[PDB]
Design a protein around this nucleic acid. Structure first.
Lengths: 144, 133, 96, 82, 231
RNA sequence: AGUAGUAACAAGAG
RNA sequence: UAUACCUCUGCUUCUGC
RNA sequence: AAUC
């Protein structure tokens, strides 16, 4: 019902097929404006950018400062930070497992595919391993 | 000790403005940043694993010597001891509705001091600070 | 909120009207597209370096191409036979 | 008690997998007592840290007088194997 | 390159420990081979001092049998291990811990030892490091031209003092033999940037995740960063 | 039956 | 098949920000 | 006569 409703609000936009996944994708952004009071997902980029520009004028030097703050945080943030995410989806076994386990399963599986970013201790290499793990043709993992 | 030694005054019914302001919830032995208190704790309980000394090593040398002499004979687990230090060093500051009293030794009793339509006079025990006065 | 109300109250013109719309959105999650969130990060990180700009851009790129799993499935029964069985998500169209 | 439903299911295998880690982490905490309070840092191996810690613990206890010649030579023999 | 020279001359004990030390400081061994060589020499100088010296049960130094060396190697080990050992000694022996990380520790002397590698003068490098340490660690400076300036109560004996100076110049001679001495003398420093770039697959996902009327992500990035939307 | 209320329980598993 | 008038189980295939 |  959520899937139907979500696509009901975007169906007048641009429908296309993803060559990466092979899935059916819909795109309402920069689409035709609504002629009814039904929920419109057709948000116009320029208006969003202008709304942000005004916010940057009304609150100056905030964006780059907050972008700095978060960036300087990122460097200090360890891999263990991921353990406090309650129940997380473990891609290896396709079950919602505890975040601490779901991480540990993902670190051990990566090691088999020559991805040891977690061993460095920082989050940044582990995130680099995640974007690189898409490129690996055959992803090996454990099953007991 | 701050309840037993204390004394109470008159209840008085009547309107009270209560203002929302960040305040210390419990009175500390010696206030420090999270790292400084942690580094002090480390020196008290786990001296070998403390690592690189900072300035703070020197600054609170009297407190460390006192706490190591005080917490010598106890059988209780380190992880418990480190938790109890952290309470009496690291600051608990959060927003509360207050009126007249801001001091931590009052903030802990706040619930019995003032409501939106009443006032209660209270005098905590022990000793009070000179700056606070 | 209490302080921000007082300001936006007394700011209004004298001999005018100040109205408070008690508001709420609908389909909040279903309408907001991930590609907007992608365009948001780019404008926020404008001054920050190219690696961080690329770092911030990933999470909205993922959500833009996300695939939703469909719960458990659908249990089918016969009241006469007193039998039950979960039709799992892949077998949703293995049945008229 | 832990939810024992896991005993009937095929995920039994995680029960030993836990207790394997728990055995390592509880031994790590015996070497490093601050591991409970403070998050330990180090890109190096977990065994390496424990070995070096136990190496000095032996050597210093001998030289201080807490360990004897009998026990020190046993301790130095074990650490050599590891 | 220096990479081949260190493989032939130095052991795998020194090759790894150097690279692990550069990893903790967040510096690349491959981008700076000369910077690795400093620590490769500095670590080998410490090992040569400790390898022969041992203590007996009575409490007197000898040369090697017993399982208790006279020296304790601090350099080479990881920070958190090294600082544990540095404190473990000073706390047991009953001395104030140094503020900097030491290199060696003598068990009979009960004093820390700091080792330095210098190209020019030994006395110049000695009095420079005296400003930092003061009188915390007993300095043992050595150099490639057989010039050395030791501490006042230097524990380095005359037998080992020769062996230290033997390898020092013997290495320096082997460096200039294949024209490798020119790279160490020349300046070397590279600015450590944060490493994060996208792969093939994820970039293609980013290219499809674009608003309507855009060719690719390059088109979206430029639009947002350049054009003015006002009105 | 009943509980419930957009789909379940009214025991499951070896 | 049989063991099984036994044995195990009571949030542990779903419960997030 | 406030910060953290």
């Amino acid at each position: 019902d959520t899937v139907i409703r979500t696509h009901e609000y975007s169906n007048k936009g641009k429908q296309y097929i993803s060559d990466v996944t092979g899935c059916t994708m819909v795109d309402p952004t920069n689409g035709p404006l609504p002629e009814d009071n039904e929920p419109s997902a057709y948000a116009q980029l320029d208006c969003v950018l202008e709304a942000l520009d005004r916010m940057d004028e009304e609150h100056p030097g905030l964006f780059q400062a907050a972008s700095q703050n978060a960036m300087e945080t990122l460097m200090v943030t360890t891999v263990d930070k991921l353990t406090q995410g309650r129940q997380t989806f473990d891609w290896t076994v396709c079950r919602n497992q505890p975040a601490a386990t779901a991480l540990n399963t993902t670190i051990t599986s990566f090691r088999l595919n020559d991805l040891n970013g977690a061993d460095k201790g920082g989050l940044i290499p582990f995130c680099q391993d995640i974007i690189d793990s898409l490129d690996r043709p055959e992803m090996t993992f454990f099953s007991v | 000790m701050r309840l037993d030694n204390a004394t109470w005054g008159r209840i008085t019914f009547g309107p009270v403005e209560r203002v929302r302001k960040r305040v210390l919830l419990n009175p500390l032995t010696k206030e420090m940043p999270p790292d400084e208190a942690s580094n002090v704790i480390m020196e008290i309980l786990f001296p070998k694993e403390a690592g690189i000394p900072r300035e703070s090593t020197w600054i609170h040398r009297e407190l460390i010597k006192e706490k190591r002499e005080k917490l010598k004979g106890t059988m209780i687990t380190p992880i418990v001891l480190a938790y109890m230090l952290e309470r009496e060093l690291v600051a608990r500051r959060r927003f509360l509705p207050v009126a007249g009293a801001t001091s931590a030794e009052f903030i802990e009793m706040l619930h019995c001091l003032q409501g939106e339509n009443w006032r209660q006079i209270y005098h905590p025990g022990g000793n009070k600070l000179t700056e606070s006065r | 909120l209490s302080n921000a109300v007082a300001k936006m109250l007394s700011n209004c013109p004298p001999g005018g009207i100040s109205m408070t719309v008690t508001g709420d959105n609908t389909k909040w999650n279903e309408c907001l597209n991930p590609r907007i969130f992608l365009a948001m990060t780019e404008r926020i990180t404008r001054d920050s370096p190219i690696w961080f700009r690329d770092f911030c851009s990933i999470a909205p790129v993922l959500f833009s191409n996300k695939i939703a799993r469909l719960g458990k499935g659908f249990m089918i029964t016969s009241k006469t036979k007193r039998l039950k069985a979960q039709i799992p998500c892949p077998d949703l169209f293995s049945i008229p | 008690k832990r939810n024992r439903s896991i005993l009937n299911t095929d995920q039994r295998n995680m029960i030993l997998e836990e207790q394997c880690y728990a055995k390592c982490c509880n031994l790590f905490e015996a070497c490093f007592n601050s591991a409970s309070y403070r998050k330990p840092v180090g890109q190096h191996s977990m065994l390496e840290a424990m070995a070096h810690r136990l190496r000095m613990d032996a050597r210093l206890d001998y030289e201080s007088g807490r360990m004897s010649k009998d026990d020190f030579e046993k301790a130095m023999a074990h650490l050599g194997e590891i | 390159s220096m990479d081949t020279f260190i493989t032939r001359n130095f052991q795998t004990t020194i090759i790894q420990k150097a690279k692990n030390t550069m990893a903790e400081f967040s510096e690349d061994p491959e981008l700076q081979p000369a910077m690795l060589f400093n620590i490769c020499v500095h670590l080998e100088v410490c090992y040569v001092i400790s390898d022969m010296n041992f203590l007996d049960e009575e409490g007197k130094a000898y040369t090697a049998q017993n399982l208790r060396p006279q020296y304790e190697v601090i350099e080479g080990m990881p920070r958190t291990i090294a600082w544990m050992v540095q404190r473990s000694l000073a706390q047991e022996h009953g001395i104030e811990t140094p503020k900097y990380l030491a290199d060696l520790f003598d068990y009979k002397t009960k004093r820390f030892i700091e080792v330095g590698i210098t190209k020019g003068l030994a006395d110049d490098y000695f009095w420079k490091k005296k400003e930092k340490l003061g009188n915390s660690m007993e300095l043992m400076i050595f150099s490639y031209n057989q010039d050395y300036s030791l501490s006042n109560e230097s524990s380095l004996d005359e037998e080992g003092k020769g062996r230290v100076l033997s390898r020092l110049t013997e290495l320096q001679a082997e460096l200039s033999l294949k024209n490798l001495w020119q790279v160490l003398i020349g300046e070397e420093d590279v600015e450590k940037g944060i490493d994060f770039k996208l792969g093939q697959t994820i970039s293609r996902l980013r290219d499809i995740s674009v608003p309507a009327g855009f060719s690719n992500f390059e088109g979206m990035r430029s639009y947002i960063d350049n054009i003015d939307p006002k009105g």
